[PDB]
Design a protein around this ligand. Structure first.
Ligand code: NA
Length: 351
């Protein structure tokens, strides 16, 4: 209903990443098949995918093409942005020093390889949805939503292989990669000790912690902790551990203080999960899909999916179905509000 929604330059942005060294915000503008780089205030810097048209082309920023990208991760040391180019079934790399877009894995077509281990474009994928970058070991962890697996790309050898999950669509939290299953994982974010990676397990409606040394995982909140086959213990309920009900969370972000932020996407809320107490509170949203800013208990979102955070504590949200990027300044409990962040200089894909 609002005038801001009519005039958005984004169409259904899926995810977000942030460069805190250089005050840059990366927006995956999924349904325009492009990446937008703005400053932390929404002012435009540069575009990757100017056509707006679904395609699969490497090269310079103006030649390059994506197909419904979602997840973005930032390599600070090398000034690179990893892209989960979902409907190209590829992992792609935006090079900001060389103004080049390169493909790191995948070949354009959906694979059936549940094991992997090939190099570069010879290794196929299946709807990669989110990524994160482990900086000491130079690994990209991939949420393969299409095979219910977490995969691992090594920067050093160019190998993409399965990292965890046997491929059955289940909420199964074992202690090895084979004895673990995922259910449409769509968000991954590393804890601050780099030993765990928190998982937004969408079709189980759970948040899970993948062990980066063993390959097993722990159930944190949401889902049925008893029957790995029940992908229906979903709902909307705050609490601790098994009390918690979520519905199809698509995004997750771990902050440096260890606190986990998530998008309870089909509940149109944004929740915070404490990794020690397993307590989940609601940070913003009512439960009704729509657009409204202000204080968070009255405020509204529409299928949010992606988060990024500054170190002064500003939490940006890809309010996907509203096609807006929003933000909340955390830890102002009585005064907490969700604002819409206008973007200046950002315009639709030119014909
Ligand atoms: Na991510």
């Amino acid at each position: 209903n609002d005038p801001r929604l009519a005039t958005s330059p984004l169409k259904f942005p899926g995810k977000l990443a942030i460069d805190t060294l250089n005050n840059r915000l990366f927006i995956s503008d999924s349904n325009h098949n492009r990446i937008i780089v703005t400053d932390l205030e929404g002012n435009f810097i540069v575009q990757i995918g100017s056509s707006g048209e679904e395609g699969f082309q490497d090269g310079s920023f103006e030649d390059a093409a994506f197909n419904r990208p979602q997840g973005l991760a930032y390599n600070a040391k090398k000034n690179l942005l990893y892209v989960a180019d979902t409907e190209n079934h590829a992992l792609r790399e935006i090079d900001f020093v060389n103004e080049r877009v390169q493909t790191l894995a995948g070949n354009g077509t959906k694979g059936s390889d549940y094991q992997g281990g090939r190099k570069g474009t010879k290794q196929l994928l299946n709807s990669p949805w989110d990524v994160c970058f482990e900086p000491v070991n130079e690994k990209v962890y991939i949420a393969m939503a299409g095979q219910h697996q977490i995969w691992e790309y090594s920067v050093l050898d160019g190998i993409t292989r399965v990292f965890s999950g046997n491929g059955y669509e289940r909420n199964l939290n074992g202690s090895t990669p084979q004895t673990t299953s995922f259910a449409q994982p769509s968000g991954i974010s590393l804890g601050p000790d780099l030993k765990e990676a928190y998982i937004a397990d969408s079709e189980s409606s759970s948040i899970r912690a993948l062990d980066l040394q063993t390959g097993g995982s722990r159930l944190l909140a949401g889902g049925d902790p008893y029957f790995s086959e029940n992908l229906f213990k979903f709902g909307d309920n705050d609490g601790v551990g098994a009390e918690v009900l979520l519905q199809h969370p698509l995004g997750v972000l771990c902050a440096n203080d260890g606190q986990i932020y998530l998008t309870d996407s089909y509940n149109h809320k944004i929740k915070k999960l404490d990794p020690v107490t397993k307590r989940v509170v609601t940070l913003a949203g009512t439960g009704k899909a729509g657009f409204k800013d202000g204080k968070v208990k009255g405020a509204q979102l529409s299928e949010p999916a992606g988060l990024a955070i500054t170190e002064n504590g500003r939490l940006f949200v890809a309010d996907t179905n509203n096609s807006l990027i929003r933000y909340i300044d955390l830890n102002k409990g009585e005064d907490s509000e969700i604002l819409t962040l206008e973007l200046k200089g950002v315009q639709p894909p030119t014909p």
